[PDB]
Design a protein around this ligand. Structure first.
Ligand SMILES: C=CCO[C@@H]1O[C@H](CO)[C@@H](O[C@@H]2O[C@H](CO)[C@H](O)[C@H](OCc3cn(-c4n[nH]c(N)n4)nn3)[C@H]2O)[C@H](O)[C@H]1NC(C)=O
Ligand SMILES: C=CCO[C@@H]1O[C@H](CO)[C@@H](O[C@@H]2O[C@H](CO)[C@H](O)[C@H](OCc3cn(-c4n[nH]c(N)n4)nn3)[C@H]2O)[C@H](O)[C@H]1NC(C)=O
Lengths: 133, 133
């Protein structure tokens, strides 16, 4: 369990940027965003080799403790042993996740949060910088 | 309040850099660092006009919920309505706080902390970036 931040007050349209080091032997890492640990509008989980999955981004939500319907992306712009930046914004309909190598995708916003107040990082990613719009 | 962060895992000699916006109407702002909210190795409180002080930085510690004795610094390189960066490092004996315009001071490490895991901001300072060197 890595950095946890609360009271972020990230409003629609504003950008959260996180830069970190992906471990040389990384298996996976997680960024969680939402209201608190039980209420995540985005669970962002690049899996290098975890849960039987290789080089796959897994995303989901968590609402009142309940995991939503998982979705997988088809591009994996991360390497073990490198620096990576992630940029996230949102509006009421979607979160937009921008990643290295030009890749961007949307994830439906399934919760009803006015602002994103909570971020937690976990796994094989050493956070070097966080910037809030 | 403002941003609260935990699991910072800051170790001796490492640098925590915090950049933010000092509000236009600033009276006072606070950056708290320590083990947790009741165990602060540094309560860093620039006062523009507050609690009986004008353009003075007040520092204190908090040990098991109990405030220590305040120390008043001799410099004040802050202005309302501006951006500011504060850089903090610590060791066995002291915290070193680097401020805008080349100023710095030391504050004794009264709790003898070997790691800083908690930070919180309050008042007229909106955190825009946090970085780890
Ligand atoms: C839909 C179920 C089908 O089988 C599997 O069931 C697993 C759960 O029983 C699925 O894994 C979870 O997927 C969740 C997202 O939908 C979360 O990723 C969950 O892990 C939560 C977690 C991660 N971490 C963590 N700590 N550090 C790191 N790097 N990750 N701690 N807690 C994973 O345990 C796993 O994704 C899923 N597989 C598929 C293909 O969907
Ligand atoms: C008639 C004078 C009585 O003496 C005063 O007594 C006050 C209350 O104990 C002293 O203030 C506290 O000093 C503490 C450090 O020793 C803390 O600064 C305390 O405020 C807690 C606090 C402030 N903030 C905050 N957030 N944002 C801002 N701007 N401030 N968050 N938590 C302040 O309420 C204040 O420093 C002290 N001043 C004198 C000169 O002794």
């Amino acid at each position: 369990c890595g950095l946890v931040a609360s009271n972020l007050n990230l409003k629609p349209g504003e950008c959260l940027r996180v830069r970190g080091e992906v471990a040389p032997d990384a298996k996976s890492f997680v960024l969680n965003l939402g209201k608190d640990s039980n209420n995540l509008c985005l669970h962002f989980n690049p899996r290098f080799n975890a849960h039987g999955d290789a080089n796959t981004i897994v995303c989901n939500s968590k609402d009142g403790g309940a995991w939503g319907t998982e979705q997988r992306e088809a591009v994996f712009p991360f390497q073990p042993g490198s620096v990576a930046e992630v940029c996230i914004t949102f509006d009421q309909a979607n979160l937009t996740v921008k990643l290295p190598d030009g890749y961007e995708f949307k994830f439906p916003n399934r919760l009803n949060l006015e602002a994103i107040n909570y971020m937690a990082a976990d796994g094989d990613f050493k956070i070097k910088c966080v910037a809030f719009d």
